[PDB]
Amino acid sequence: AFDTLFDHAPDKLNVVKKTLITFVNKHLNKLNLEVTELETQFADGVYLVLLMGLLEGYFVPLHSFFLTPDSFEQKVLNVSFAFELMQDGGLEKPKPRPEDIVNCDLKSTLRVLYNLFTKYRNVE
């Protein structure tokens, strides 16, 4: 379904990417964080964790994840934890493996972000 928005409407795909860009900045700019590139800036799991707290109304204690991950393994653990926060919030288990996000798979990244956008687009 989303895969058709991805592959066989590449100017719709670019339209979705700018929508997701505007959505994540609405929230992350509150922490003085700016997103300009969806292909890489969610790969280490940090902004996904911060975004979930901004969207669902909680702080994530810094001992619960790796704010500055120093290995592929810590980035995978961050993304897995963000996936757990997503399920806590009512989303079904995300389809991509956490390593797919860390590896900057654009489709996996956009699928996860799009499901957040579908759910939380009206949060202020």
Binding site: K30, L31, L50, G53, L54, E56, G57, Y58, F59, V60, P61, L62, H63, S64, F65, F81, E84, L85, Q87, D88, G89
Partner: protein, 271 residues
């Protein structure tokens, strides 16, 4: 046989729903002649392990020995109950947060505020004499209840159980900076509670919600990493200013114990 059967869920009379949120549902009800509140907990991936843990953690909350501590009256084990459930007495004025910030009929005066502070300090001093809890306790104005005679009581039902996600913090404005950043086992948990009391003092002085203009994520990140602190209120007595500053010491080891500030607050009472 088990040492506790807990409260029989079938004996609960559910009267009216009070609230529902991420953590579960609150109901006003009745049980064995008591006016009660029931919390039905929402838990993802409930398991026998988590149920065993709930049943081991609840007995410690049944504290009947201090006027400024509100006990859990009991808990419903699940199974056989549909969901893990907590019961406490109905407190007619609700939480301290409700009384200070959502009070449409009266504004509590500062003599009552100083009495609330003394009540909370006495209850915390007593709790701090007990062996540590497995559930995480957090002192804030939502976890203090105001009884029918206006006595403030620490609510034992508001602990966070081992199966409730430690990764989601919903009232960070009251949490000590070190507790935003370090695992509980790496902090002095009793000194962290003094910071929370300092923020309660600030709330009693200003009658404002701390960091009301910020989201919980913004609060935790700015307090932990950018040194955000409550602004010391203008035009208060030097004595109150001094007490609030010592309770909010950046160094956890230099904060007073609750049993040290109880006599200070006693001398500040009107009667």
């Amino acid at each position: 046989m088990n040492k506790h059967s807990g409260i029989d869920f079938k004996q609960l009379n559910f009267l009216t729903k009070l609230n529902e949120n991420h953590s579960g549902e609150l109901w006003k009800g009745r049980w064995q002649g008591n006016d009660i509140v029931v919390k039905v907990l929402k838990v993802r991936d409930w398991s026998t392990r988590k149920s065993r843990d709930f049943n081991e953690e609840c007995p410690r909350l049944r504290i009947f020995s201090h006027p400024n501590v509100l006990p859990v009256l009991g808990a419903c084990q699940s199974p056989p109950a549909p969901h893990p459930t907590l019961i406490t007495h109905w407190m007619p004025y609700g939480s301290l947060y409700n009384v200070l910030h959502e009070g449409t009929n009266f504004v509590v005066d500062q003599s009552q505020a100083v009495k609330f502070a003394l009540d909370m300090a006495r209850g915390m001093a007593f709790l701090h004499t007990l062996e540590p809890l497995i559930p995480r306790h957090a002192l804030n104005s939502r976890s203090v209840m105001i009884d029918e005679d206006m006595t403030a009581r620490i609510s034992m039902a508001d602990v966070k159980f081992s199966f409730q996600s430690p990764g989601r913090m919903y009232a960070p404005a009251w949490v000590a900076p070190e507790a935003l950043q370090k695992k509980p086992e790496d902090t002095n948990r009793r000194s962290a509670d003094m910071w929370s009391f300092a923020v309660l003092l600030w709330e009693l002085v200003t009658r404002e919600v701390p960091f009301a203009d910020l989201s919980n994520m913004e609060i935790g990140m700015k307090v932990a990493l950018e040194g955000l602190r409550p602004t010391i209120p203008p035009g208060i007595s030097p004595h109150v200013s001094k007490l609030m500053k010592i309770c909010m010491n950046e160094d956890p080891a230099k904060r007073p114990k609750f049993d040290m500030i109880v006599p200070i607050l006693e001398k500040m009472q009107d009667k």
